[PDB]
Design a protein around this ligand. Sequence first.
Ligand SMILES: COc1ccc(S(=O)(=O)N(CC(C)C)C[C@@H](O)[C@H](Cc2ccc(OCP(=O)(O)O)cc2)NC(=O)O[C@H]2CO[C@H]3OCC[C@H]32)cc1
Lengths: 99, 99
Amino acid sequence: PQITLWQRPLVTIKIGGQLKEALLDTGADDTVLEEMSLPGRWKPKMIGGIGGFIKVRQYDQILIEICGHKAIGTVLVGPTPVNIIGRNLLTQIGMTLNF
Amino acid sequence: PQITLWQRPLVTIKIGGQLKEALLDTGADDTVLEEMSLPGRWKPKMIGGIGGFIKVRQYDQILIEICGHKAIGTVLVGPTPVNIIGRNLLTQIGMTLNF
Ligand SMILES: COc1ccc(S(=O)(=O)N(CC(C)C)C[C@@H](O)[C@H](Cc2ccc(OCP(=O)(O)O)cc2)NC(=O)O[C@H]2CO[C@H]3OCC[C@H]32)cc1
């Protein structure tokens, strides 16, 4: 499928058996999601954004479906304006930029 | 052509007679560049992301050459840690996400 950019590339993701809305973000190295519960232990990570740095909880090998495509990777959880799918997962679903 | 997401999709833009490196960002509604002078009138604006908000100056109808494409759009100028090419400009050059 092809997604244009006239509107925000908001897609439905499934994580922990629940559907959520997330933004396909090519400007994000990592995937950052709003507060939620995830299994296992988490490690600390400091990530920088447009307004500065924040602290997030890093969970690895988390199953997450993005537009029906199954991925298994790192998911950071913390104070983000919206759920964002970064390059770590965009690459897993074979997404690229084309012009 | 096709642009992989294995690394940050960085490109060289031309604006106001200066060469800058910028990030092709589908997660950015608008294009945001580090401090620089631009002609015309501007409006103060506040934009937010990870880490909070930053104040910027909004310039409209700005010409920017990118990937061999001369495109016009709004440019936000402020203390952004990285130069960002947002959807407002990405659409003009016919860039799309594909999987
Ligand atoms: C209205 O117009 C707007 C234009 C742009 C923004 S934004 O930038 O907040 N942001 C919007 C969305 C996250 C809410 C666009 C993102 O793609 C942002 C872009 C970005 C910001 C900073 C940055 O440098 C961080 P440093 O290296 O620590 O100095 C790089 C990219 N990426 C980002 O927040 O990535 C995070 C998720 O992994 C990480 O990848 C790099 C930033 C860390 C909001 C509004």
